[PDB]
Amino acid sequence: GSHMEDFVRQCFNPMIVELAEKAMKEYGEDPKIETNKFAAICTHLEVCFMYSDGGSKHRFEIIEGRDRIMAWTVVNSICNTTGVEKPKFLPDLYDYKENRFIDIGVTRREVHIYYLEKANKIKSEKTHIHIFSFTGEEMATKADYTLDEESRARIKTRLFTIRQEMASRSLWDSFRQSE
Ligand SMILES: O=C(NCCOc1ccccc1)c1nc([C@@H]2CCCN2C(=O)CCc2ccccc2Cl)[nH]c(=O)c1O
Numbered sequence: 001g002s003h004m005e006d007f008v009r010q011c012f013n014p015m016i017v018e019l020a021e022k023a024m025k026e027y028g029e030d031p032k033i034e035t036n037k038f039a040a041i042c043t044h045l046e047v048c049f050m051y052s053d054g055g056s057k058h059r060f061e062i063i064e065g066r067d068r069i070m071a072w073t074v075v076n077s078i079c080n081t082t083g084v085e086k087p088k089f090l091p092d093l094y095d096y097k098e099n100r101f102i103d104i105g106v107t108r109r110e111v112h113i114y115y116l117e118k119a120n121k122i123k124s125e126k127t128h129i130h131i132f133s134f135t136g137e138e139m140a141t142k143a144d145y146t147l148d149e150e151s152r153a154r155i156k157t158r159l160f161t162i163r164q165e166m167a168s169r170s171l172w173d174s175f176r177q178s179e
């Protein structure tokens, strides 16, 4: 019964918490034990949702937060109708405006490092990458940040708020060192 599990539950909204614990279940991890990862997935989820709200009405298709079969199902439907490369790994969103998949990263480390690590792993030329940090830095593929500045700023604000809430509860160091 960790302080972190209770913090997560009153910091993120119940829909986010539900989706996160389900995602961990499907991959056989326990939110009760792997608490830092629990917080990370909720954070990643909330960022993806704020991101998808950033655009026009139906600009983004949300792939993160689905179960794996349905997520892949939507990917092939997008691919088989837009003639776009089928990625090796599940992206987080699809941008109908820019006709590309997006994987969103959230890191406690330096954004350059995390970006470099992600590009190698995804091993998809076409997948756009957009990294946010808890300190307010962002790095996006080809310097193309997709959204306007204000949508990205509220994401960065929320991320820094989470960091303060954690640190005020002494969970930040453990969370920072866990990545
Ligand atoms: O979609 C992603 N992974 C597919 C699902 O993998 C799970 C694996 C275990 C449980 C539940 C799910 C994804 N993974 C990652 C990173 C590096 C690769 C593995 N990883 C993580 O396990 C970190 C925690 C995480 C899990 C899921 C979603 C977001 C995060 Cl942060 N970073 C993304 O930005 C991203 O989108």
Ligand SMILES: [Mn+2]
Pocket: 064, 090, 091, 092
């Ligand atoms: Mn994802």
Ligand SMILES: [Mn+2]
Pocket: 044, 092, 103, 104, 105
């Ligand atoms: Mn992601």
